[PDB]
Amino acid sequence: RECDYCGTDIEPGTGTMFVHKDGATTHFCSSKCENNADLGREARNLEWTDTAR
Amino acid sequence: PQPSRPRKGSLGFGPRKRSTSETPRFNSWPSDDGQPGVQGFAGYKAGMTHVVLVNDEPNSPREGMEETVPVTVIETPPMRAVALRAYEDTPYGQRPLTEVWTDEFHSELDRTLDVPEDHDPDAAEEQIRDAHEAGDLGDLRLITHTVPDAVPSVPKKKPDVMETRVGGGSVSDRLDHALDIVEDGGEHAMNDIFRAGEYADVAGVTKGKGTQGPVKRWGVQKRKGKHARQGWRRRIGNLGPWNPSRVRSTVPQQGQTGYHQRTELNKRLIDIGEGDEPTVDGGFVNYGEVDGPYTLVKGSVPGPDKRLVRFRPAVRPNDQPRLDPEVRYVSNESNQG
Amino acid sequence: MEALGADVTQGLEKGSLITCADNTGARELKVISVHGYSGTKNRHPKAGLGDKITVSVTKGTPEMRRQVLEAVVVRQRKPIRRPDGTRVKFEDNAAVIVDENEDPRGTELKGPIAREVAQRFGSVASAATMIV
RNA sequence: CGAGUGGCUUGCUACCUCGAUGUCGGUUCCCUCCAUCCUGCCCGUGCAGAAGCGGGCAAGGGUGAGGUUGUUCGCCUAUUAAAGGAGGUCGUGAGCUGGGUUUAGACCGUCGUGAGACAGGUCGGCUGCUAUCUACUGGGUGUGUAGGUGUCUGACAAGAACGACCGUAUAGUACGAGAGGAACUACGGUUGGUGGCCACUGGUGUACCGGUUGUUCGAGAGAGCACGUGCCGGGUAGCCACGCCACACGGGGUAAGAGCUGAACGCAUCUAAGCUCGAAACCCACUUGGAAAAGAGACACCGCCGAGGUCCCGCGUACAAGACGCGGUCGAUAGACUCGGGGUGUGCGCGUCGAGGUAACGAGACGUUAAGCCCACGAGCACUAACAGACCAA
RNA sequence: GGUCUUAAGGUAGCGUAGUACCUUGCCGCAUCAGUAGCGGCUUGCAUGAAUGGAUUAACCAGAGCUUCACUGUCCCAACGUUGGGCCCGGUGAACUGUACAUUCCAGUGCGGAGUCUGGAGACACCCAGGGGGAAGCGAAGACCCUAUGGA
RNA sequence: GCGAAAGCCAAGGCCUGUCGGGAGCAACCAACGUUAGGGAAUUCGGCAAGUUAGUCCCGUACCUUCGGAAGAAGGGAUGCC
RNA sequence: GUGGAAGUCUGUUAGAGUUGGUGUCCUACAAUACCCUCUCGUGAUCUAUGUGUAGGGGUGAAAGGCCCAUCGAGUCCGGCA
Ligand SMILES: *C(=O)[C@H](Cc1ccccc1)NC(=O)CCCCCN
Ligand SMILES: [Cl-]
Ligand SMILES: [Cl-]
Ligand SMILES: [K+]
Ligand SMILES: [Mg+2]
Ligand SMILES: [Mg+2]
Ligand SMILES: [Mg+2]
Ligand SMILES: [Mg+2]
Ligand SMILES: [Mg+2]
Ligand SMILES: [Mg+2]
Ligand SMILES: [Mg+2]
Ligand SMILES: [Mg+2]
Ligand SMILES: [Mg+2]
Ligand SMILES: [Mg+2]
Ligand SMILES: [Mg+2]
Ligand SMILES: [Mg+2]
Ligand SMILES: [Mg+2]
Ligand SMILES: [Mg+2]
Ligand SMILES: [Mg+2]
Ligand SMILES: [Mg+2]
Ligand SMILES: [Mg+2]
Ligand SMILES: [Mg+2]
Ligand SMILES: [Mg+2]
Ligand SMILES: [Mg+2]
Ligand SMILES: [Mg+2]
Ligand SMILES: [Mg+2]
Ligand SMILES: [Mg+2]
Ligand SMILES: [Mg+2]
Ligand SMILES: [Mg+2]
Ligand SMILES: [Mg+2]
Ligand SMILES: [Mg+2]
Ligand SMILES: [Mg+2]
Ligand SMILES: [Mg+2]
Ligand SMILES: [Mg+2]
Ligand SMILES: [Mg+2]
Ligand SMILES: [Mg+2]
Ligand code: NA
Ligand code: NA
Ligand code: NA
Ligand code: NA
Ligand code: NA
Ligand code: NA
Ligand code: NA
Ligand code: NA
Ligand code: NA
Ligand code: NA
Ligand code: NA
Ligand code: NA
Ligand code: NA
Ligand code: NA
Ligand code: NA
Ligand code: NA
Ligand code: NA
Ligand code: NA
Ligand code: NA
Ligand code: NA
Ligand code: NA
Ligand code: NA
């Protein structure tokens, strides 16, 4: 699997899946990502993110 | 009315004092069923990671499916049965009779023992067989020690010595089996005793926490509400009733917590290998790198990283052995981050 | 009951206010008890995903209000662990009113549902729009 | 109607304390009783089944959360296997609380000429002390057994280390007109309790990194203060629970009870002698402590001019002193350095762009730059420091 | 009852009251559940007109209740910060002390014993702890009664 | 900055609110920070803590002794260049 | 619009007061202290100094409050052994 946020590979037996109100799903590899997300930031704008890279 | 409630903490692991030996001492051994064989082995704790396994359970609606399982990596290099001790049955229980030692010793066993320079193996052996002829021979065990020098991550070189029982077919047959092992050099390995998939009982001295209060040591509540602001936060209500006018040893009080021996039952051996396959990136925190004989124990094991832990075939298993479980993935991800 | 096939950290207590994920006319539900549960001194009875809880209607249609009904917990904010180790959490806490036979009192379920709830309440599941 | 047992209620008595034994309730924490609420094993039934009702053994474990009331009690709600009662100075204020009772202030009603009174109501109304002894939880130093190292034994001691529930198969089966509806056994899970552990999730993380407000160091750069982080955002290690792992069965002897063989009493009889079974209870099993067990233990090796130990030095798998454990050049024990593995989130400077502005100036954007800064972890590495050396000892 | 004591015999209002014994009165609101609170009823143990009655905008560190919001008050506790605490140098009190004292379980005794009686346990000394007991220390009981006491 | 307010800083004063040294510095205590999900279930009682917050614009109920209630409530804005 | 009233409002301006924490202290720093919280803050306001009222007497927006840590009758000595 791949983190729906930063893009790096999610180490198996790890991570969280957040189910949205509408039903959408979002796998996170870590708290760091989840948290950057809750701040309303988009991975594309964070230079450390594989996505942005 | 005062609602009922179980007492705080168990009264079966006391007194809660510091352990006499950092090296565990089993007080029970498996039953003499199968072929003769040493009933235990030892190693040093290193750390934890998880592994993906194929549901092995025949009764699980998930049998055959992936499954993440927590594992504690334990370096289990070879050990050496340096002697065979014999016990005799007497009106006062079992007592050591004699011992059969060898000559081939590990370079640094003298860091702990006054290694034998002159011993009579045969006389000992004779005395034992005569005892057996007379039928006073009590169980047979081997004096064993570890080779810490074989484990880089562990600072000590001084070997840890412990006695392990030998359970086998007949007494004669296992008596012989013992001597054979010893005579060689006593060199044996985890393979020779355990097979991945079997259940073992792991013993060890827990992580020490020095002195601790009742709340942490016994699980008593914290003062609640207003009471927590009056001057008392972590002290129990009272040491007892007016009468009996003495404090009963059963009331939760402060003291040594941790560094106690514990024999944790039915631990499943997920795998027994050798190499660096189980090591984590960056190295096991406060331990080091693994690259040699190892064992993967399901779940947790008492004691801190580097501490000696002991294995013994489960003495009271609940499930039947399900040998060599399929391991599809062993995480090597850094434990830092 | 049947194994949920996932570990749960009850994220609710007696007295908690959760969402009613259905069209029964009940909007808000107040947890009153957890079926088959017995706690321990001072402990607040707890409930999570897959539990059948007794509830009272706090908000909704006048006729539904104040009624004491049964329901099933379909979603909770507090994480749950699935067999492969992954954690799963939702955007809100929700339950669906059920009857004696455990058939939804309503006709439609609003929002997603945890797959685990299926292995327990079939008719509730077979009425789901989305099953994560 | 008669005979009793208990000492929880209420009353009686005035033995004990008025040079004071701190009140009610609650709370917290410990032990116990059985007249048993649930659970185990049983008997009867107006026992078809299911669900009950009544009784016997039985105190191992459990007996929970809430709404009114200071309440104890009690009423009420939803859960539950069940949500039993009672003793411990109506256990528990050198533990807490202080709502009530029961000081001084005040009001109402009633009573009184009045002061003032009223288990009538009402608002407000304080909680002292540095532990000598003893008691227990844990930690040491000595002596005794009578040189040392290592490994054991087990008299005894503690445990609830496990209690309970739901679901599936059995089975829509036995039973029953039907409605309805079991069990043995085998499985999965939950709950409470218990011990441990941190890969995973989560908390902290005044290590660290970034953003930014006010002010001061002229600006810039880089910094101090704003309570012991200014505030905001992220967070490693460790510690943790909200996270994760583990916690039988089975033997032996019994109770109630079901029976066998069997006599007194040729018959009958579970009992008198004998015997087969049979409880969550008892014993063992399992975990923990345990040579100070005065019968003060056993074994192996080393040593009595030398075995071993203490001090010393570098450190922690240990730690309030003490203790404990490891390493000490025949070395990787700690530090430096360099890698590895991690945390932040892209440094200073310079270049280009930039709403504009004559210009000066210019918030900010892009590049250089996964940059800069930082790390309580690992590895490599004898470079630095584990040197020198003292002592006790049959 | 359809007058009598003793002059009159409770009017407007208010009312289960900060006044209501019975009492958690009855009905309703509100809550899953409300001895509370509010509204209605009200025969008021024992309301009521300057012993002021009713009522009332504004005001209140005044008493009670409800809602939203909030949150470590709680479920259930954890980690952290600072000052202590612990070890070391220096300084250096007090409370309290009939004696003896390593106690425990029972009993007995002026009926609430470390010291009596019977048993059990118990090698000595020391460090830290939280306070079960010494009916712990502190105060010639402030309650109650008694005194041919006091104010 | 509304300010004789906070915070920071001069001039001036001081390191005498006068015992120190050591242990990652344990239990426990005083002050205090942060705590996931729940959100008063705590308790006599929300005690303690928390929430809200400055300024401008919009907007503002019952009741009222017409003064008030009222900053009711609720909604939006807020920097730098 | 002007004006700028008020035993008016907000306010740790100064200053006055003392509600809760039943916190800290309780052989105290203190024979009434410390901290946070809280009330008033143009008036029946607060305050310094001077001055008057004296013990069955004062003084008292009244609590039997206060009259030098002393008040339901101050303190000292005497009556008094
Ligand atoms: C009634 O029970 C009295 C009430 C009282 C007496 C005096 C002052 C105020 C209140 N309470 C007592 O008598 C308690 C006595 C305590 C004795 C303790 N040793
Ligand atoms: Cl408490
Ligand atoms: Cl409940
Ligand atoms: K008395
Ligand atoms: Mg991760
Ligand atoms: Mg207090
Ligand atoms: Mg980690
Ligand atoms: Mg409670
Ligand atoms: Mg006392
Ligand atoms: Mg009985
Ligand atoms: Mg018992
Ligand atoms: Mg009592
Ligand atoms: Mg009690
Ligand atoms: Mg006491
Ligand atoms: Mg007291
Ligand atoms: Mg005290
Ligand atoms: Mg009171
Ligand atoms: Mg009151
Ligand atoms: Mg009275
Ligand atoms: Mg009162
Ligand atoms: Mg002697
Ligand atoms: Mg600072
Ligand atoms: Mg009423
Ligand atoms: Mg009149
Ligand atoms: Mg005696
Ligand atoms: Mg007296
Ligand atoms: Mg009196
Ligand atoms: Mg008189
Ligand atoms: Mg929280
Ligand atoms: Mg409540
Ligand atoms: Mg309660
Ligand atoms: Mg408050
Ligand atoms: Mg004013
Ligand atoms: Mg003001
Ligand atoms: Mg004057
Ligand atoms: Mg008076
Ligand atoms: Na206190
Ligand atoms: Na306090
Ligand atoms: Na007492
Ligand atoms: Na009797
Ligand atoms: Na006395
Ligand atoms: Na009490
Ligand atoms: Na029982
Ligand atoms: Na109640
Ligand atoms: Na008492
Ligand atoms: Na009390
Ligand atoms: Na008290
Ligand atoms: Na049995
Ligand atoms: Na001995
Ligand atoms: Na009247
Ligand atoms: Na006032
Ligand atoms: Na806190
Ligand atoms: Na005591
Ligand atoms: Na000085
Ligand atoms: Na005008
Ligand atoms: Na004050
Ligand atoms: Na006088
Ligand atoms: Na005189």
Short mmCIF file of all heavy atoms in Angstrom, two decimals, chain E residues 72-73 77-79, chain F residues 33-35, ligand 52:
data_model
loop_
_atom_site.label_atom_id
_atom_site.label_comp_id
_atom_site.label_asym_id
_atom_site.label_seq_id
_atom_site.Cartn_x
_atom_site.Cartn_y
_atom_site.Cartn_z
P G E 72 -9.81 17.80 30.07
OP1 G E 72 -8.52 17.43 29.45
OP2 G E 72 -10.99 16.94 29.86
"O5'" G E 72 -9.57 17.96 31.64
"C5'" G E 72 -10.65 17.82 32.58
"C4'" G E 72 -10.21 17.01 33.77
"O4'" G E 72 -9.93 15.65 33.34
"C3'" G E 72 -8.96 17.51 34.48
"O3'" G E 72 -9.07 17.28 35.88
"C2'" G E 72 -7.86 16.64 33.88
"O2'" G E 72 -6.73 16.48 34.70
"C1'" G E 72 -8.60 15.31 33.69
N9 G E 72 -8.05 14.49 32.63
C8 G E 72 -7.51 14.92 31.44
N7 G E 72 -7.07 13.95 30.70
C5 G E 72 -7.34 12.80 31.43
C6 G E 72 -7.10 11.45 31.12
O6 G E 72 -6.57 10.97 30.12
N1 G E 72 -7.54 10.61 32.13
C2 G E 72 -8.14 11.02 33.29
N2 G E 72 -8.51 10.05 34.13
N3 G E 72 -8.36 12.28 33.59
C4 G E 72 -7.95 13.12 32.62
P U E 73 -9.74 18.40 36.82
OP1 U E 73 -10.30 19.47 35.95
OP2 U E 73 -8.77 18.76 37.87
"O5'" U E 73 -10.98 17.65 37.46
"C5'" U E 73 -11.20 17.66 38.87
"C4'" U E 73 -12.45 16.90 39.22
"O4'" U E 73 -13.60 17.53 38.61
"C3'" U E 73 -12.54 15.45 38.76
"O3'" U E 73 -11.83 14.60 39.64
"C2'" U E 73 -14.03 15.20 38.83
"O2'" U E 73 -14.53 14.97 40.13
"C1'" U E 73 -14.58 16.54 38.32
N1 U E 73 -14.79 16.49 36.87
C2 U E 73 -15.83 15.70 36.40
O2 U E 73 -16.59 15.11 37.15
N3 U E 73 -15.95 15.62 35.04
C4 U E 73 -15.16 16.24 34.11
O4 U E 73 -15.33 15.98 32.92
C5 U E 73 -14.12 17.06 34.66
C6 U E 73 -13.97 17.16 35.99
P A E 77 -7.45 5.31 38.72
OP1 A E 77 -8.25 4.09 39.00
OP2 A E 77 -7.31 6.34 39.78
"O5'" A E 77 -6.00 4.83 38.28
"C5'" A E 77 -4.93 5.77 38.06
"C4'" A E 77 -4.47 5.72 36.62
"O4'" A E 77 -5.48 6.33 35.77
"C3'" A E 77 -3.23 6.54 36.34
"O3'" A E 77 -2.04 5.85 36.68
"C2'" A E 77 -3.36 6.85 34.86
"O2'" A E 77 -3.02 5.74 34.05
"C1'" A E 77 -4.86 7.11 34.76
N9 A E 77 -5.17 8.52 35.03
C8 A E 77 -5.84 9.05 36.10
N7 A E 77 -5.94 10.35 36.07
C5 A E 77 -5.28 10.71 34.90
C6 A E 77 -5.03 11.96 34.30
N6 A E 77 -5.44 13.12 34.81
N1 A E 77 -4.35 11.97 33.13
C2 A E 77 -3.95 10.80 32.62
N3 A E 77 -4.13 9.56 33.09
C4 A E 77 -4.81 9.59 34.24
P A E 78 -0.69 6.67 36.97
OP1 A E 78 0.22 5.74 37.66
OP2 A E 78 -1.02 7.98 37.58
"O5'" A E 78 -0.12 7.02 35.53
"C5'" A E 78 0.10 6.00 34.54
"C4'" A E 78 0.57 6.62 33.25
"O4'" A E 78 -0.45 7.52 32.75
"C3'" A E 78 1.79 7.52 33.38
"O3'" A E 78 2.98 6.75 33.38
"C2'" A E 78 1.65 8.44 32.18
"O2'" A E 78 2.05 7.86 30.95
"C1'" A E 78 0.14 8.65 32.14
N9 A E 78 -0.35 9.85 32.83
C8 A E 78 -0.91 9.95 34.08
N7 A E 78 -1.27 11.17 34.40
C5 A E 78 -0.92 11.92 33.29
C6 A E 78 -1.05 13.30 33.00
N6 A E 78 -1.59 14.19 33.82
N1 A E 78 -0.59 13.72 31.80
C2 A E 78 -0.07 12.83 30.96
N3 A E 78 0.10 11.52 31.11
C4 A E 78 -0.35 11.12 32.32
P C E 79 4.25 7.27 34.20
OP1 C E 79 5.26 6.19 34.22
OP2 C E 79 3.76 7.82 35.48
"O5'" C E 79 4.79 8.48 33.32
"C5'" C E 79 5.31 8.22 32.02
"C4'" C E 79 5.43 9.50 31.24
"O4'" C E 79 4.12 10.09 31.06
"C3'" C E 79 6.21 10.62 31.89
"O3'" C E 79 7.61 10.41 31.88
"C2'" C E 79 5.74 11.81 31.07
"O2'" C E 79 6.30 11.85 29.77
"C1'" C E 79 4.25 11.50 30.93
N1 C E 79 3.48 12.16 32.00
C2 C E 79 3.03 13.47 31.78
O2 C E 79 3.25 14.00 30.69
N3 C E 79 2.35 14.11 32.76
C4 C E 79 2.12 13.50 33.92
N4 C E 79 1.47 14.19 34.85
C5 C E 79 2.55 12.17 34.17
C6 C E 79 3.22 11.54 33.19
P G F 33 -1.56 24.74 34.71
OP1 G F 33 -2.28 25.86 34.05
OP2 G F 33 -2.35 23.67 35.39
"O5'" G F 33 -0.62 24.04 33.62
"C5'" G F 33 0.27 24.84 32.80
"C4'" G F 33 0.96 23.99 31.77
"O4'" G F 33 1.94 23.12 32.39
"C3'" G F 33 0.08 23.03 30.98
"O3'" G F 33 -0.60 23.72 29.93
"C2'" G F 33 1.08 22.02 30.47
"O2'" G F 33 1.81 22.53 29.37
"C1'" G F 33 2.01 21.89 31.68
N9 G F 33 1.61 20.83 32.60
C8 G F 33 0.93 20.98 33.79
N7 G F 33 0.72 19.85 34.41
C5 G F 33 1.30 18.90 33.59
C6 G F 33 1.40 17.49 33.74
O6 G F 33 0.99 16.78 34.67
N1 G F 33 2.06 16.91 32.67
C2 G F 33 2.57 17.58 31.60
N2 G F 33 3.16 16.83 30.67
N3 G F 33 2.49 18.90 31.44
C4 G F 33 1.85 19.49 32.46
P U F 34 -2.05 23.22 29.48
OP1 U F 34 -2.55 24.19 28.48
OP2 U F 34 -2.86 22.92 30.69
"O5'" U F 34 -1.73 21.86 28.73
"C5'" U F 34 -0.75 21.83 27.69
"C4'" U F 34 -0.52 20.42 27.26
"O4'" U F 34 0.29 19.71 28.23
"C3'" U F 34 -1.76 19.56 27.18
"O3'" U F 34 -2.54 19.87 26.04
"C2'" U F 34 -1.16 18.16 27.19
"O2'" U F 34 -0.55 17.80 25.98
"C1'" U F 34 -0.06 18.34 28.24
N1 U F 34 -0.52 17.97 29.59
C2 U F 34 -0.41 16.65 29.98
O2 U F 34 0.10 15.79 29.28
N3 U F 34 -0.91 16.37 31.22
C4 U F 34 -1.49 17.26 32.10
O4 U F 34 -1.92 16.85 33.18
C5 U F 34 -1.54 18.60 31.64
C6 U F 34 -1.06 18.91 30.43
P U F 35 -4.00 19.23 25.88
OP1 U F 35 -4.55 19.71 24.59
OP2 U F 35 -4.76 19.49 27.13
"O5'" U F 35 -3.65 17.68 25.77
"C5'" U F 35 -4.66 16.70 25.73
"C4'" U F 35 -4.07 15.34 25.94
"O4'" U F 35 -3.15 15.38 27.05
"C3'" U F 35 -5.13 14.34 26.34
"O3'" U F 35 -5.76 13.78 25.18
"C2'" U F 35 -4.34 13.32 27.16
"O2'" U F 35 -3.72 12.34 26.37
"C1'" U F 35 -3.30 14.22 27.85
N1 U F 35 -3.63 14.65 29.22
C2 U F 35 -3.63 13.69 30.23
O2 U F 35 -3.32 12.53 30.06
N3 U F 35 -4.01 14.16 31.46
C4 U F 35 -4.37 15.44 31.79
O4 U F 35 -4.80 15.67 32.92
C5 U F 35 -4.31 16.37 30.71
C6 U F 35 -3.95 15.95 29.50
NA NA H 52 -3.84 17.61 34.96
#
